[PDB]
Amino acid sequence: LTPAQALDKLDALYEQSVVALRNAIGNYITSGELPDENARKQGLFVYPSLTVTWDGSTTNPPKTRAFGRFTHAGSYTTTITRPTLFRSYLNEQLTLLYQDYGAHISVQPSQHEIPYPYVIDGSELTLDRSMSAGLTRYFPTTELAQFSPLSHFDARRVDFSLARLRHYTGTPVEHFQPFVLFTNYTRYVDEFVRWGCSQILDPDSPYIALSCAGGNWITAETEAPEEAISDLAWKKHQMPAWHLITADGQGITLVNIGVGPSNAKTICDHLAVLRPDVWLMIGHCGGLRESQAIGDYVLAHAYLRDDHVLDAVLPPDIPIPSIAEVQRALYDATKLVSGRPGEEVKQRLRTGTVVTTDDRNWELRYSASALRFNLSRAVAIDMESATIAAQGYRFRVPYGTLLCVSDKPLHGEIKLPGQANRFYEGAISEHLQIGIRAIDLLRAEGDRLHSRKLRTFNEPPFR
Amino acid sequence: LTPAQALDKLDALYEQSVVALRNAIGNYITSGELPDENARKQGLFVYPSLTVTWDGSTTNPPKTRAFGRFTHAGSYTTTITRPTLFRSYLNEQLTLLYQDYGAHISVQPSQHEIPYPYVIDGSELTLDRSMSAGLTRYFPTTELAQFSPLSHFDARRVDFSLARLRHYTGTPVEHFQPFVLFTNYTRYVDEFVRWGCSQILDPDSPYIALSCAGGNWITAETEAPEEAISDLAWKKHQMPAWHLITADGQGITLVNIGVGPSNAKTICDHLAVLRPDVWLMIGHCGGLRESQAIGDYVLAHAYLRDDHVLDAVLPPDIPIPSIAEVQRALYDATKLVSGRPGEEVKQRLRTGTVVTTDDRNWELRYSASALRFNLSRAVAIDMESATIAAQGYRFRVPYGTLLCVSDKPLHGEIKLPGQANRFYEGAISEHLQIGIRAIDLLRAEGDRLHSRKLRTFNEPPFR
Amino acid sequence: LTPAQALDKLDALYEQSVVALRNAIGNYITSGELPDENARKQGLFVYPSLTVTWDGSTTNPPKTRAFGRFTHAGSYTTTITRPTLFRSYLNEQLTLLYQDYGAHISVQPSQHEIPYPYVIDGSELTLDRSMSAGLTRYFPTTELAQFSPLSHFDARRVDFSLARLRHYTGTPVEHFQPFVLFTNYTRYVDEFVRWGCSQILDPDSPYIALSCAGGNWITAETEAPEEAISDLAWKKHQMPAWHLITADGQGITLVNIGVGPSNAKTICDHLAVLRPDVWLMIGHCGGLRESQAIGDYVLAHAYLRDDHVLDAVLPPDIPIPSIAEVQRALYDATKLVSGRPGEEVKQRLRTGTVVTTDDRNWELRYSASALRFNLSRAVAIDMESATIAAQGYRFRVPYGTLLCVSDKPLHGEIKLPGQANRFYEGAISEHLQIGIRAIDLLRAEGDRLHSRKLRTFNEPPFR
């Protein structure tokens, strides 16, 4: 079976099942009819299954490629969902294994049923208690409990996160671009939207659309480009997102994750299933060194993890490295945008260890932290960095952090983003531009972007 | 010196210093003039100091009162800030020690200077780098490096939190009421404002005003009571607050803390300095038992602390108890507001252990958590409870938690806040009313509210 | 006082004290005469003391330099030993502070006496028990329990390590060069000596001498350059060293630390006092990825610390970053020497996380380690790397690791250093050359080499 063939059969089996599940739900609601356990056993409400097999012998198998590689010979399978949505990705991946390895591709019904909530296209159902109780009782519901994996996530895990992304983001998952930017300050999105609307108008710019948290779709032929940032978004969605789309889907997605490790973890948990090409943390931080000035930039080369939120799945003694590719991009982008070539940057940019804490009022316990700050040669403190970085590491998503000093806790200039602090607010536009330029630089690097620094021993074939 | 005298002298010394500091700042800005180190040594920019002394001999000293008591004989002192703001509190406290113990009160300049940022009534003065550098260099600044304590917080710690409360809350600290309600869902404030505006209109209701996050002040003689909830509030402030004020300052303050342990901890750190009479957690949770129905209520009698955020200052093995007074109020209010002719609360209310986690996607690791959930006899899971409760314990603020099941993760009904949930949205109004009634019941209890369950061995004299 | 003046006075006071101490010892040995407690109180047997003071005001103080900087105004002092030995270093350092800050330099007797064992130049005066007991009783001994630090180490700590370096190394501390190479396989020194002797003969090469472990001094005018590697060295010294010296003392020192974290830690502890410019780990490792071929190179970008030896002074959760400057040099040198121009290095060079263990037979417990190897995305495993890197971090000595796969434990190719390993043995010469070329590249970078990534908050003025 070939890539295009597999994709078509996945589409077929998927659509068929969701349509079948919808009907059953409809019938149960209109009359009280239940599906026959026999047809289900046949794969009535089942996700398609993709299996790739490799004999284990090829002339010269790619030994340098970061993804689309095989560690050993055997069969790799995985349940698939939303084939159309992942068309490109699945094509690209299956193609790599088909050609470079001459792998056997096969598609068939899985043993896993699609939880009914994921097939209800419109809105969540709102039947009376007796009705809901019946649905959860006779239909496929989510099951919290959960020879080789072909990809990082299975169908259920992906459907789970797609629903969440939409809810938290107030945006359709189809609009998400491969290059992500995370911010922890509302003004960054103000600046992003402005620069975005502007780009849409320039006929030379690839940016043709702007998806907005809340539903707004802005294009070059839109009447009132002011509805871009509807204040209602921040009340409806916890982590508002904005997508600057391009025809080839190589735009920039910006998510305002807010503040705290909890949110940073959560958003990455879901965004990971879209297999982004990279996500950068572009936000404010507290400068810990006497020589830093508000408005300066910090490029993180390591993290002191005091965020706790990931300690169970990724112990604090596991090193989270930097991605050279991303570091260079971040560094060069700072030279370019900040208008200071060579090593003039040194006066505006500091590269060092960032401390991420889950305690916003960490200042009330400075003495208790001082030793570790010193021990780690801390240069700045924030609340999302390490988390974003750890998640990128966990999910194989290139990551990086370029923060901007919004204050100096240890040197009297204590403040809080969202108050009277002109030197930081004046840095915002520039800061955002550095992130955007880094993305441009990385987007150009093509495949060089992804390296082997994130691969595990049992790394799945799909990127 | 008597209470009223002490209060007047504190007011005098305080205003004098803040005025002196403003002048010095103005002079330095207009000309470049610096204050003379001699006048400062005299207490030019200094916080007033309040000292209460007790000989150690009185007929029958209160041995049962939770607060306003002396452990031993001696002198107790503390720097004071915003005497006017704390007029009632300070009066009530000094009065108890003055009469019941015949204590000696004295007010004098302290050795601590008021950090200039706290005297700048308006926003920050827009100064260039050279100017700011000078201010932080020649004037008092907030420093992290920080006979017996008279109160829980000193002037600097208090000023620090007052500025914060205003920023996070979008409200003036003068409007905060003694009875606090914390919510984690935007709809609760919608319901609170509605019920509030309504009360303001009822001539029999003590509620005469409604302070709104953002600046709005609604009274019985206000034209458009719709500006109560300005959507812009949720963009400008992280933890919007609303105060239903009464003439005697015994109203109800509601803060939407949002989601996560980080925020819960932060807000409590600052709100603690206003010495609230009680704070209740009124939010949604996930029901963990199959016999629970969406919309049911959970009264927490214990907490499994998986929030991490407070592990350093309060180890997980330190037991956080329940306050019987608050429990009864919460239980009775559930009977009253929810009460139905032919039924017992047991069918709607479950009393048990709540798990508070910093991991929103804890479901992705159920197996790893299952043992502890069982071990703890967990009944519900949320993200703020334990934190609010632990902070209450730490700051001696009676606390309680009454949650409402918004979904059942372990039983095929995963629903998210804001998603279409017929039976949880329908419970919000009643839920809020239970909180409000519990407050009413506690407000009536007068002093019974506060007990000795929160006192430490070195408990300060002031409540 | 000027740098040159300070150096002369340090030399004077130092020589004077060591001479005074020798006499006193001589007198006690020949007759039984004890020094008078009065002359001692005057600084008879005392180390010189160097003090630098800074008013705290300078036009534009260096805010970018990695070393020779002041954090605040005040006085910095330290006891000094072997001024002649450290002449260059002390000169360079005092000069930076003298000119760039116009600092006040002063030299005077300290309150610390030189332990007599450090003044016994030969150490060959055998004394009976009664005599030794007397010496330790009436003279300055090495006390184990040993206004702001001017440098990282004090006179006693330095003397302590200089003695050790000589003993372990079988070399005079005066011969140590600023650029260090650490190896864990004897063949690397064979290759180093060969390439060294050869360089000494080329009239264009800066290398004019070769100090050998054991005592040999080889020059362009030496008869038998075969005595370079005397087999007796490996029996006499635990960590033999070899120095390729140049007229300006910018050669290359190579130390064969052997195997194990204990040795790696120990050698660094002592070598640190000579304030090297950099030290690189050039040794073999086990390749953990099936795509790696024996002979391939591993550039470490992070370390999984399973060495234990440094856990107490540097907790495993403290991140040990990579030094970009060193990483580039190592990377570039691999391109140049490995003659694989461009991105083709990828096939020979793998950049990733290295696991350092103190358990050579770790293979007997693979299952127990597999989880962490995977968790850390381990690429190779060795026994010195992390330790060397940690020590570099702790002592502010730029560091880096470029290992060469000598075997593949996880893939049926286990090989022991010294066994017939066609593809590892054939790469040793190339490997060593990569290290040497990295040093050449770094040596050219001048001051760029040192960055601020290693500075602590209380970082001493001296490099």
Side-chain angles (χ1 to χ4, degrees), chain A residues 196 200 206-211 217-220 243-247 252:
Chain A
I200 287 178
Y207 303 117
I208 61 185
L210 177 59
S211 193
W217 178 264
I218 296 175
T219 178
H243 313 285
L244 238 203
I245 312 168
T246 72
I252 297 183

Side-chain angles (χ1 to χ4, degrees), chain C residues 45-334:
Chain C
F45 306 154
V46 150
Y47 288 96
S49 181
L50 177 59
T51 307
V52 174
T53 311
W54 187 53
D55 46 292
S57 57
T58 296
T59 50
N60 59 299
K63 293 292 183 178
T64 299
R65 193 161 57 198
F67 55 80
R69 203 206 303 180
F70 279 116
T71 293
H72 55 69
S75 286
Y76 304 76
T77 190
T78 180
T79 50
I80 294 289
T81 187
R82 309 272 254 97
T84 297
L85 175 61
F86 294 101
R87 170 72 68 159
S88 301
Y89 176 72
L90 293 176
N91 186 49
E92 174 210 358
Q93 301 308 303
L94 282 174
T95 292
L96 287 171
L97 306 174
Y98 188 61
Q99 306 187 305
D100 289 296
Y101 289 81
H104 180 61
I105 307 173
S106 80
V107 176
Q108 61 288 309
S110 74
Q111 294 303 111
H112 301 294
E113 300 195 305
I114 302 177
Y116 82 75
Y118 302 140
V119 295
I120 289 177
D121 195 56
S123 306
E124 305 171 65
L125 307 180
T126 55
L127 294 72
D128 63 71
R129 294 187 184 296
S130 184
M131 274 279 260
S132 295
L135 272 179
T136 62
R137 179 183 176 181
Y138 298 118
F139 292 88
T141 52
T142 52
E143 289 185 293
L144 228 47
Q146 49 184 299
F147 199 47
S148 184
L150 173 55
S151 70
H152 306 273
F153 307 100
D154 75 357
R156 291 213 200 67
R157 170 47 199 282
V158 182
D159 267 335
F160 174 76
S161 294
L162 293 184
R164 250 78 168 176
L165 261 187
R166 173 160 186 54
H167 174 64
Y168 289 129
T169 272
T171 280
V173 297
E174 308 86 54
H175 297 165
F176 280 77
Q177 301 302 289
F179 308 85
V180 182
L181 244 42
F182 290 126
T183 64
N184 56 3
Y185 186 36
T186 196
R187 277 222 54 209
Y188 282 92
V189 6
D190 293 324
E191 218 62 59
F192 182 66
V193 168
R194 162 178 151 302
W195 174 81
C197 290
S198 171
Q199 291 302 105
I200 287 177
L201 267 32
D202 174 356
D204 300 300
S205 180
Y207 305 116
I208 63 190
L210 177 61
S211 185
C212 305
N216 270 44
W217 177 268
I218 296 177
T219 175
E221 45 199 51
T222 293
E223 294 300 64
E226 302 68 60
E227 281 63 293
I229 297 179
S230 174
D231 282 10
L232 177 57
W234 274 287
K235 177 189 177 178
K236 284 181 177 178
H237 314 98
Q238 292 184 45
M239 292 159 270
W242 281 269
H243 315 283
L244 236 210
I245 311 168
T246 74
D248 55 330
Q250 301 288 295
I252 298 180
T253 285
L254 175 152
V255 189
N256 189 53
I257 63 187
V259 56
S262 285
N263 274 196
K265 174 186 184 295
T266 306
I267 193 58
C268 290
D269 270 345
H270 307 307
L271 192 45
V273 305
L274 293 184
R275 307 277 65 219
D277 279 312
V278 67
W279 56 48
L280 283 28
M281 180 63 234
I282 297 290
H284 58 80
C285 70
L288 300 174
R289 299 310 180 86
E290 79 72 33
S291 74
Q292 299 176 116
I294 290 183
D296 285 347
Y297 300 120
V298 166
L299 173 63
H301 73 354
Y303 306 86
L304 173 60
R305 287 143 58 50
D306 278 20
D307 45 337
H308 305 318
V309 78
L310 285 173
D311 293 355
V313 299
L314 195 66
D317 61 302
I318 302 297
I320 304 307
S322 297
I323 314 313
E325 300 57 50
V326 179
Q327 299 289 283
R328 286 169 212 136
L330 250 11
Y331 184 78
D332 290 345
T334 299

Side-chain angles (χ1 to χ4, degrees), chain A residues 16 23 25 33 68 70 84 89 120 126 136 156 192 196 213 264 269 342 351 368 377 385 387 395 407 411 434 462:
Chain A
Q16 180 165 55
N23 274 39
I25 296 175
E33 179 182 358
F70 279 116
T84 298
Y89 177 79
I120 287 170
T126 31
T136 62
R156 296 212 199 68
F192 182 69
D269 273 347
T351 291
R377 316 283 195 282
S385 287
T387 310
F395 302 126
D407 72 297
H411 303 83
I434 292 176
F462 282 14

Side-chain angles (χ1 to χ4, degrees), chain A residues 47 59 76 101 172 198 208-209 212 262 275 285-287 338 390 393 413:
Chain A
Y47 288 101
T59 51
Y76 304 73
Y101 290 80
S198 182
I208 61 185
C212 305
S262 284
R275 310 274 66 217
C285 68
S338 184
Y393 175 93
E413 296 149 277

Side-chain angles (χ1 to χ4, degrees), chain A residues 124 167 238 262 358 360 409 420, chain B residues 124 144 238 262 358 360 417 420:
Chain A
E124 307 78 35
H167 176 63
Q238 291 183 45
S262 284
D358 59 353
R360 169 124 61 177
Chain B
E124 188 183 304
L144 281 53
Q238 294 185 43
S262 281
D358 61 354
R360 169 121 62 173

